[model samples]
Target: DAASDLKSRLDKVSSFHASFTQKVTDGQEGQGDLWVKRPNLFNWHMTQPDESILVSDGKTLWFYNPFVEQATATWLKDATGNTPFMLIARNQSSDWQQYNIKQNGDDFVLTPKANLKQFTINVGRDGTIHQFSAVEQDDQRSSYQLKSQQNGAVDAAKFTFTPPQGVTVDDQRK
Candidate 1:
């Protein structure tokens, strides 16, 4: 089962770089980067027309959009609970059992157990996640594929935030 596989794999992983490529509406593609550490921290950065960091420090999630000159903040606890962000941050692979898992060719395809809003994650046999493809209960489908990953120690201070000049910082601390 994918859940069992993920459980074991996650147990062995401490930290890794998370990257994804997504196909857009015009058939073009976009990419993003995230620095992840086990048991709580993740920082996402988008690179394309502009660059910015979207961060979550276990308790808060912040989206800093440089081009827009603004940042959006939300409580981490309220972010749908099933996001890979939560999955990785909380090391809650057991929650994966709530999804239907099966082998889709060489990849494991996971679908939500019921009609609920969630994303599907595809994993390679080596414990590397290859993609995140999903469709909402309303049939909205989107897929994110991983490009590469490297493991090593992630400095804890990296999760710490520092506000820059001219950029708005929104705090979701509760």
Candidate 2:
């Protein structure tokens, strides 16, 4: 099943803990940690000077920003018809085939038929992602790292979060 290495590399994934750092030329750069529990559940932990938490409990979603002191809760189903938040844990090859893959050194680089962006993937033999990166439209690239992970089966409840202590919650489940 070597049809597409990228597809299988992501296939071994069940749930994972990953982190990312950003670099923006015209803007600012920051860092964050991520947790995924599968089937539309994850926690995107963002950090200062604006601290925030974007979490999903499969059915509900909540995003709280400390700087603004606000937590927005919404129905996950109503948030968006397409769940694009869990891109790293996805293994869909149907539309992914439209991308070309080339062996560039030890890493596999990719680009779409429409030349959307370049994705560089570094994977282990287990077909799990070790390191990955992406190129943006303005060349202001942002990359991700697979780090701060534990070998033991990670706790399931880590993917979802509760409202911040006494924070203002704007329930938008309507």
Candidate 3:
């Protein structure tokens, strides 16, 4: 029932842009803006203590750190199972099978059914993601909170990434 509720709510969202704050167990804090389009397109721009950008064009995932002038690209298919953003952007009912869902009051907690790292997502009653907290395999904990959200159509070009001049790119897709 909880899964169905989540799916039904998510189905209504074609695109969304949100402001978010992130905290890590190591005492790091940052703020960012996230843009998402259905069927696997997203751009996350972090603009706080450090500047970094992550973009996915449904096929390739790019991570760029302007501070270091380095970027890494990987195939989206290879990273989907391990990416939380893909869970919302992909929009396929079959994706729900990867996680066991539970309703905690007005929130839904999703536990990965596989060997992936575990995380808890707190979804608001209105179906917005309120918070996401995870403990990495290396014993580091990370938490993210959605500050504000807007659902609608987002410009497709926002998902494209172009590294700055003089930046080194490590394209790992094969």
CA displacement after TM-score superposition, residue 3 of candidate 2 (Å): 6.8
Clashing pairs in 2: none
Q: Model 3: per-residue lDDT, tens digit, 1-174?
A: 877877776666668898889897832698988898878899989898799888999889999998888999999988775655666667567777778888766566677777236556776556576777665566577678989999888988899988779999998988
Once fitted onto the true fold, the runs of candidate 1 whose alpha carbons sit more than 4 angstroms away are 25-28, 80-82, 104-106, 114-118, 136-140, 172-174
Best by TM-score: 3
**Per-residue lDDT of candidate 1, residues 9-39 (tens digit):** 6656678787788653312367887678867
The CA lDDT of each predicted structure is: 0.67, 0.63, 0.78
- After superposition on all C-alphas, the RMSD of every candidate to the true structure, in Å, is 3.2, 4.2, 2.1
Query: What number of clashing residue pairs does each candidate have, in the order they appear?
Result: 0, 0, 0
For each candidate in turn, the TM-score is: 0.77, 0.66, 0.88
Prediction 2 global C-alpha lDDT:
0.63
